[PDB]
Design an enzyme around this catalytic site. Sequence first.
Site, PDB file in Angstrom:
ATOM      1  N   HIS A   7       7.562 -38.219 130.237  1.00 19.80           N
ATOM      2  CA  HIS A   7       8.719 -39.041 129.878  1.00 19.80           C
ATOM      3  C   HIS A   7       8.576 -40.515 130.291  1.00 19.80           C
ATOM      4  CE1 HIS A   7      11.496 -35.268 129.492  1.00 19.80           C
ATOM      5  NE2 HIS A   7      10.733 -35.460 128.431  1.00 19.80           N
ATOM      6  N   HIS A  28       5.255 -29.842 122.245  1.00 23.68           N
ATOM      7  CA  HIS A  28       6.015 -28.809 121.524  1.00 23.68           C
ATOM      8  C   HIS A  28       5.142 -27.784 120.773  1.00 23.68           C
ATOM      9  CE1 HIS A  28      10.420 -30.374 121.715  1.00 23.68           C
ATOM     10  NE2 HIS A  28       9.784 -30.538 122.863  1.00 23.68           N
ATOM     11  N   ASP A  32      15.527 -33.657 134.195  1.00 20.07           N
ATOM     12  CA  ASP A  32      14.802 -34.625 135.024  1.00 20.07           C
ATOM     13  C   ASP A  32      15.414 -34.627 136.420  1.00 20.07           C
ATOM     14  OD1 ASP A  32      13.159 -35.778 132.833  1.00 20.07           O
ATOM     15  OD2 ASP A  32      14.989 -36.806 132.225  1.00 20.07           O
TER      16      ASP A  32
HETATM   17  C1  HEM Z   1      10.610 -30.453 131.549  1.00 18.39           C
HETATM   18  C2  HEM Z   1      11.250 -30.007 130.453  1.00 18.39           C
HETATM   19  C3  HEM Z   1      11.510 -30.983 129.289  1.00 18.39           C
HETATM   20  C4  HEM Z   1      12.673 -31.203 128.670  1.00 18.39           C
HETATM   21  C5  HEM Z   1      14.028 -30.521 128.956  1.00 18.39           C
HETATM   22  C6  HEM Z   1      12.448 -32.201 127.647  1.00 18.39           C
HETATM   23  C7  HEM Z   1      13.397 -32.710 126.797  1.00 18.39           C
HETATM   24  C8  HEM Z   1      13.217 -33.793 125.967  1.00 18.39           C
HETATM   25  C9  HEM Z   1      14.229 -34.360 125.100  1.00 18.39           C
HETATM   26  C10 HEM Z   1      15.675 -33.823 124.964  1.00 18.39           C
HETATM   27  C11 HEM Z   1      13.680 -35.400 124.453  1.00 18.39           C
HETATM   28  C12 HEM Z   1      14.359 -36.317 123.414  1.00 18.39           C
HETATM   29  C13 HEM Z   1      13.931 -36.000 121.975  1.00 18.39           C
HETATM   30  C14 HEM Z   1      14.590 -37.021 121.077  1.00 18.39           C
HETATM   31  O1  HEM Z   1      15.849 -37.090 121.088  1.00 18.39           O
HETATM   32  O2  HEM Z   1      13.886 -37.788 120.360  1.00 18.39           O
HETATM   33  C15 HEM Z   1      12.306 -35.534 124.891  1.00 18.39           C
HETATM   34  C16 HEM Z   1      11.420 -36.491 124.455  1.00 18.39           C
HETATM   35  C17 HEM Z   1      10.115 -36.625 124.857  1.00 18.39           C
HETATM   36  N1  HEM Z   1       9.405 -35.706 125.622  1.00 18.39           N
HETATM   37 FE1  HEM Z   1      10.311 -34.268 126.824  1.00 18.39          FE
HETATM   38  N2  HEM Z   1      11.123 -32.578 127.684  1.00 18.39           N
HETATM   39  C18 HEM Z   1      10.514 -31.852 128.689  1.00 18.39           C
HETATM   40  C19 HEM Z   1       9.180 -31.906 129.018  1.00 18.39           C
HETATM   41  C20 HEM Z   1       8.232 -32.722 128.448  1.00 18.39           C
HETATM   42  C21 HEM Z   1       6.796 -32.604 128.618  1.00 18.39           C
HETATM   43  C22 HEM Z   1       6.135 -31.481 129.458  1.00 18.39           C
HETATM   44  C23 HEM Z   1       6.221 -33.606 127.934  1.00 18.39           C
HETATM   45  C24 HEM Z   1       4.720 -33.942 127.762  1.00 18.39           C
HETATM   46  C25 HEM Z   1       3.895 -33.929 128.824  1.00 18.39           C
HETATM   47  C26 HEM Z   1       7.293 -34.375 127.317  1.00 18.39           C
HETATM   48  C27 HEM Z   1       7.127 -35.482 126.533  1.00 18.39           C
HETATM   49  C28 HEM Z   1       8.102 -36.144 125.836  1.00 18.39           C
HETATM   50  C29 HEM Z   1       7.917 -37.425 125.195  1.00 18.39           C
HETATM   51  C30 HEM Z   1       6.640 -38.293 125.174  1.00 18.39           C
HETATM   52  C31 HEM Z   1       9.251 -37.745 124.539  1.00 18.39           C
HETATM   53  C32 HEM Z   1       9.593 -39.011 123.738  1.00 18.39           C
HETATM   54  C33 HEM Z   1       9.470 -38.756 122.242  1.00 18.39           C
HETATM   55  C34 HEM Z   1       9.737 -40.043 121.479  1.00 18.39           C
HETATM   56  O3  HEM Z   1       9.673 -41.167 122.059  1.00 18.39           O
HETATM   57  O4  HEM Z   1      10.007 -39.934 120.264  1.00 18.39           O
HETATM   58  N3  HEM Z   1       8.499 -33.817 127.649  1.00 18.39           N
HETATM   59  N4  HEM Z   1      12.053 -34.533 125.824  1.00 18.39           N
END
Ligand code: HEM
Length: 250
Positions: A163, A42, A208
């Site tokens: 993810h 982010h 996804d």
């Molecule tokens: C492709 C577009 C993406 C979308 C639409 C997206 C959306 C989201 C959403 C909605 C969450 C949940 C946040 C929460 O409720 O705690 C999340 C969590 C997360 N995202 Fe993504 N994301 C994207 C790409 C990425 C990328 C590029 C990365 C890093 C390489 C990433 C890494 C993570 C991780 C590690 C979590 C888990 C956070 C936790 O466990 O607290 N995401 N993402």
Amino acid sequence: SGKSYPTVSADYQKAVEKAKKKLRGFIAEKRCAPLMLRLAWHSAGTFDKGTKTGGPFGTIKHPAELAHSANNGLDIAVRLLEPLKAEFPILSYADFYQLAGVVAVEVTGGPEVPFHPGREDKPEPPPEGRLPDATKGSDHLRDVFGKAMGLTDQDIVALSGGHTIGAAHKEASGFEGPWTSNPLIFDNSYFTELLSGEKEGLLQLPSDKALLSDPVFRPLVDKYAADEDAFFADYAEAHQKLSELGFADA
Ligand code: HEM
Ligand code: NA
């Protein structure tokens, strides 16, 4: 790469190395790797190549940026890192947060993403609304990762594999649960779950699922599901690029 990394002092380099070790221990103990990866992502994902604004320049710690709805729950991440950051006053917040992201991937068993220091902490957060919308699809992903950040279709699929660690929270985004049966283990399971369909207890965002139906994204999902080594290689490449958007020219 188009990258010319800045010179930093030997003392800066020593601090990077020491901070890297302290981050491993802290992130492992706190079980916060996924949250730290999200914080790094982010921070970086706001980059707009056209205007050269946003990107991994320490702005996510600003109250104004933390308040962005996309950043719900990241205030926790910033607070968790503050004591450790204070042990390394020479480092920029910008570098520190990207280093934490790199370490998060490493300590969960992921690839070693190359790290180059020198990001400056910039005064102005980018405007809100650049980060991707989980309810949208492939056109939207290309707008955000491609037209704004300047990353490739391959980078999009590989980075979505982030993810493979962590979970959504109904109190943060509104979505709920982990993508994988092992949310603190970095592996190709995200793609294998995507292919197998909806399993109870596991999360799939519309963003996804969009990877499965796109002509370019689908072969990449298949590749990564079949070949974790190929995933790790492409992931390390994409994460490095993401962590360096707007940094070291480019
Ligand atoms: C492709 C577009 C993406 C979308 C639409 C997206 C959306 C989201 C959403 C909605 C969450 C949940 C946040 C929460 O409720 O705690 C999340 C969590 C997360 N995202 Fe993504 N994301 C994207 C790409 C990425 C990328 C590029 C990365 C890093 C390489 C990433 C890494 C993570 C991780 C590690 C979590 C888990 C956070 C936790 O466990 O607290 N995401 N993402
Ligand atoms: Na996993």
